[PDB]
Amino acid sequence: MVRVGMRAAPRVSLEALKAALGGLKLSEAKVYLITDWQDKRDQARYALLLHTGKKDLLVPDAFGPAFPGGEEALSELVGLLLAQGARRFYEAVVSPGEMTALLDLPPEELLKRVMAIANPTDPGIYL
């Protein structure tokens, strides 16, 4: 799996995601938003694991209200994925102190862990 974007860099990460995605259709994809356990969602950060079924992509913890412009970038990101056909969204919650370690796991290990702990989520909460 490819890794694009950078931690705490929402705008650059969104641009990198758009570049890697292109016009790819995502109807059978599973979109995993990886977030930290904070008191309120208004403090949350998010990483993205996009499982298309034919290839995976990871973006580190670059989105969300935890970063300036991050909530806006997350909204634009989810809108883009919906526009390209993605309909299955999930959220995995991890401790703040283990987020970077999780994201640095070998691709197969990361995918297994995120898939195991993620719950279906309504993409509208990110819009």
Q: For residue 29, what is the domain's CATH number? A: 3.40.1530.10
CA dihedral 65, 114, 21, 53 (to 10 degrees): -150
| Count of structural domains, the chain | 1
- Amino acid (one-letter) located at 49: L
Segment (H or E) for 100? helix 99-103
**What method was applied to determine this entry?**
X-ray
In angstroms, the CA 45 to CA 22 distance is 24
Sequence-separated (6 or more) residues with CB below 8 Å from residue 102: 34, 94, 110, 113, 114
- Where in the sequence is the domain holding 76, given as residue range(s)? 2-127
